[PDB]
């Protein structure tokens, strides 16, 4: 004889009619009951715990959303923003960001029950800001819009933090703190945030992949998530190398700023970034053909005749170096910088 | 889909106000013994447990 009973009451006819009109897209009924009805509560709630703005946002109703957003006593505006960000509705997000509560970008990044969707609880975790949720959901236009208003993902501290803010957070709850750290890293390790947040995303994604790789070993619990985040940080750089068309684009992905770097010992390029990619074990970045052709041209290096030969040819040359080894030794000692040196 | 410590302790353990606390400061392990008895292996192999 038990039921869930998320409202524990019954609605009126002028409230069930308004909620059905808001849910199913009946724009003139909603307009008439907002203009010519004064004994109605706009914040009347469904059987499950949803008011009319949440039914309008959850069903992609832009006209009802823009019509409800001029009432100046609506509840659950931050939850409607989070639901529209998670579902991917760019026009509803741009309509909700014109409300006079996100006026100066006040509540887009970094208690007040603003993002609650019921009497008790938020839809996502309490640390999840709009920018973190937009980076989780790979929404490039919403991420660009939220970065345009000055919202950033705050980088979490080290695992052995002992500050006045790490200690009370870890003493209050040792589960929510680790979940908050992994949510911030899942936000930071996304291609939508990596491509739009920094000015050099290759170096940022390489260092972030290394940081998540060592954090997978420090925290033995929740390791299969840090490994996944590091793998997608590597996949970002590999996918950025794949869409290269010229030689200067390949040399800007594989090597850094070639005007502000040392050219090297010889006419070969500056190999400082590929050493870092081998150190961080980004294997598909090094096994990619655009890297393989450059490494082959450095590897051969004034033997282009022996490049196209066969393996039967490259056994006789090894035996020739085996016979005449002191000869090449003393001409390397006594006369460098020659045709053979 | 648990976020706090009290939600994990309400799924893994029962009503902690109406259960015996245990021999020491450890929680009441009566439900996890039942989950091992009934061989609910992913409930016990879950990271929150």
């Amino acid at each position: 004889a038990y039921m869930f009973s998320d409202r524990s009451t019954s609605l009126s006819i002028e409230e069930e009619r308004f909620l059905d009109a808001a849910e199913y897209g009946n724009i003139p009924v909603v307009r008439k009951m907002l203009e010519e009805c004064h004994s109605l509560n706009v914040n009347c709630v469904d059987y499950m715990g949803q008011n009319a703005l949440q039914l309008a946002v959850a069903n992609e109703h832009l006209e009802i959303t823009e019509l409800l957003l001029k009432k100046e006593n609506l509840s659950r505006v931050g939850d409607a923003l989070l639901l529209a960000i998670s579902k991917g509705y760019v026009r509803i997000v741009e309509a909700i960001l014109s409300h006079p509560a996100f006026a100066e970008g006040k509540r887009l990044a970094t208690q007040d029950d603003f993002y609650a969707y019921d009497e008790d609880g938020t839809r996502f975790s309490h640390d999840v800001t709009p920018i973190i949720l937009a980076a989780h959901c790979q929404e490039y236009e919403i991420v660009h819009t939220l970065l345009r208003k000055g919202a950033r993902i705050e980088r979490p501290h080290d695992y052995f933090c002992k500050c006045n803010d790490c200690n009370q957070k870890q003493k209050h709850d040792s589960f929510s703190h680790s979940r908050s750290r992994i949510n911030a890293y899942k936000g930071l390790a996304s291609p939508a945030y990596l491509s739009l947040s920094s000015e050099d995303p290759v170096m940022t994604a390489l260092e972030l992949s290394n940081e998540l790789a060592v954090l997978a070993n420090i925290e033995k619990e929740f390791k299969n998530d840090y490994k996944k985040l590091s793998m997608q940080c590597k996949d970002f750089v590999v996918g950025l190398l794949d869409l290269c068309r010229n030689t200067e684009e390949v040399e800007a992905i594989l090597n850094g700023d070639v005007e502000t770097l040392q050219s090297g010992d010889h006419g070969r390029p500056n190999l400082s970034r590929l050493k870092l990619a081998i150190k961080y074990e980004v294997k598909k970045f090094v096994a990619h053909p655009n890297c393989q052709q450059q490494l082959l041209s450095i590897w051969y290096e004034n033997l282009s005749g022996l490049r196209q030969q066969t393996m039967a040819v490259k056994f006789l040359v090894v035996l020739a170096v085996a016979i005449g080894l002191p000869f090449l030794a003393l001409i390397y000692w006594f006369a460098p910088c020659s045709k053979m040196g | 889909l648990c976020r706090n410590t009290e939600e994990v302790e309400a799924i893994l353990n029962g009503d902690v106000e109406t259960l015996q606390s245990g021999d020491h400061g450890r929680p009441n392990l009566s439900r996890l013994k039942l989950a091992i008895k009934y061989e609910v292996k992913k409930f016990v192999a879950h990271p929150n447990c």
Binding site: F4, D6, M48, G49, D118, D120, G121, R123 | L1, C2, E6, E7, A10, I11, G14, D15, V16, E17
Partner: peptide, 30 residues
């Protein structure tokens, strides 16, 4: 008490996540 409140919150989270999961199912021709 508190346990009934926590279980109500968790059952509501489960039903919303289950509706999300059935919305993530493929489209058939009916």
């Amino acid at each position: 008490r508190q346990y009934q409140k926590i279980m109500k919150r968790l059952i509501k989270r489960y039903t919303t996540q289950a509706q999300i999961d059935k919305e993530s199912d493929e489209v058939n021709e009916g």
